[PDB]
Structure 1
């Protein structure tokens, strides 16, 4: 459950990210592929080589989505309904993987935003990705 306070910090953090979103997404993505090799199984039609167009393109799709979630926080499930049907019913990615992408996002975020990433920001951010993750795996069944 997103608290008024969480929302606020999420808006702030994410706005500080600003036009780095994508860049942050790709870095995050890449950090995921090296750290948890098993997530690569869901991307076999991808060049997953260091700094590479697919990933640097996909990172953009991933952080733009997040962005839509920040803006659409008080209402995350309708905002994200599509993303839900592709990840749960079509792509069918296992919830574990989401915990991993989150962690990596946090590392990435945590490493470019040294002063905004306080222990309350860190916290909120974790509730936020968790929530996005739920809405995203929710329609498994």
Structure 2
């Protein structure tokens, strides 16, 4: 459950991603695939090489989904219902993998947004990504 301060912090921090959405999302995916190779199992027919245009394209989708979550942060299950059906019903992604990607998103934001990534904002981003993860791993239709 996010505090009002959490929502403020997330909107401010994530708001700085802007046109770097694809770039940052792709970097977070690449970090996940490299650091935690078991995650590659969910993408059996992807080109997961360094600099892959396919990962770049997927990175933009993930980042844009996070933008969607921010714009609906008080009512996320209804805003992400399509993504929950994909990840929980169709793909059956083990919840641990969301902790791994969330961590890699935090690493990416820490590496690109040093002034924004204060301990308080770090805390809020972690809670936000955990909330998004809970929605995407739940079946609630």
Length-normalised TM-score, structure 1 = 0.97
User: When you count helix as a share of all residues, which structure comes out higher?
Assistant: 1
Shift of 1:140: 8.3
- Structure 2: how far apart are the matches of 1:51 and 1:127? 30
- Structure 2: how far apart are the matches of 1:133 and 1:38? 18
- Structure 1: how far apart are the matches of 2:2 and 2:19? 24
What are the superposed Cα offsets for residues 10-62 of structure 1, whole Å, 9 maximum, x if unpaired?
00001111211111000000000000000000001101110101101100110
Could you tell me whether the CA contact under 8 Å between 1:88 and 1:140 is conserved in 2? no
Could you tell me whether the CA contact under 8 Å between 1:89 and 1:140 is conserved in 2? no
What 5-or-longer segments of structure 1 have no aligned partner?
none
- Runs of 4+ in structure 1 deviating by more than 4 angstroms, as ranges, are none
RMSD of aligned alpha carbons: 1.2
Alpha-carbon distance change, 41 to 51 in structure 1, aligned in 2, over 3 angstroms: same
Matched residue count: 141
Shift of 1:103: 0.2
SS of equivalent to 1:140: coil
What are the superposed Cα offsets for residues 74-109 of structure 1, whole Å, 9 maximum, x if unpaired?
111000000000000101110000000000000001
What 5-or-longer segments of structure 2 have no aligned partner?
none
